[PDB]
Amino acid sequence: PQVADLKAFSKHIYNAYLKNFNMTKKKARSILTGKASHTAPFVIHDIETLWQAEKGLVWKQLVNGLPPYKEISVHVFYRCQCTTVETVRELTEFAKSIPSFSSLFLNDQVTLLKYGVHEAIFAMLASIVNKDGLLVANGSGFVTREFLRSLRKPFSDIIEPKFEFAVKFNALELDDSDLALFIAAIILCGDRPGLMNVPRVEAIQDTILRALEFHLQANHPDAQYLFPKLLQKMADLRQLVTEHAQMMQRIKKTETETSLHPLLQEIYKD
């Protein structure tokens, strides 16, 4: 009985995911491998191709919108910020499409997103990443990892650890239906500081994890240890975000000319 109920639960979480996320891992890998399209992403690998992309790529955020121009490395950081805020919006709608999330009081919803979105972002990031770079502008562009490594500190350093995590994460070969459950488990996390109804969130988190575990038994029947492996990734994501926050703190202290989106400021506020 347990197994059958969880299967319907996982399907509703998967529908929430399909309804709300801009791009699926299925779509991303088809672009990154080159099978899908009559057109390939524009490759951004240096200043000239970045400039050409800003001139000719369609970006969710108009360039004129980004904070005033400062320099190549900050400009790139502003696009990272713009896409992060866009992904917070999507993750917020994903969570609200999960009834047990929407049944929580609104202040606990905020606490869960506050301390969960960056873990979920960096997990979902792996879907648009390969070892050579990542997709941008809805799959219109591909920014090489080498280019991002060429940016000056501290902007290059905040970027490379995410690639390291993503490449290892992609070798577990999760599909979008796995990720929907994995991301939901990250958001509904009973450990977040200042949660009001902890036992409620813990019970939801436990339900998602049981669903996840049964989900991988059907969808990945030959992958030994894959469920405990994903629990370790969820611990690894906390450490990745702790370091990310530390690096963001340094950027705030030493890059005083770089502006930070106020919503992200609220997230880091502690």
Ligand SMILES: CC(C)N(Cc1ccccc1OCCCCCC(=O)O)C(=O)c1ccc(-c2ccco2)cc1
């Ligand atoms: C995660 C995801 C949303 N990113 C950002 C990203 C990817 C990998 C590593 C790090 C990183 O962001 C670190 C700074 C984040 C600050 C905000 C915060 O903490 O809230 C991207 O999709 C992205 C990457 C590169 C570009 C880009 C356009 C032009 C040339 O390059 C555009 C978007």
Ligand SMILES: CCCCCCCO[C@@H]1O[C@H](CO)[C@@H](O)[C@H](O)[C@H]1O
């Ligand atoms: C259900 C709507 C009514 C909600 C009223 C309760 C709001 O409490 C506030 O919730 C925030 C976490 O989200 C915390 O940051 C604040 O410290 C806390 O004071």
Ligand SMILES: CCCCCCCO[C@@H]1O[C@H](CO)[C@@H](O)[C@H](O)[C@H]1O
């Ligand atoms: C769109 C959902 C994601 C929002 C993430 C940002 C949360 O910021 C927090 O908002 C609370 C008010 O609700 C304040 O009480 C906290 O001091 C602040 O840290």
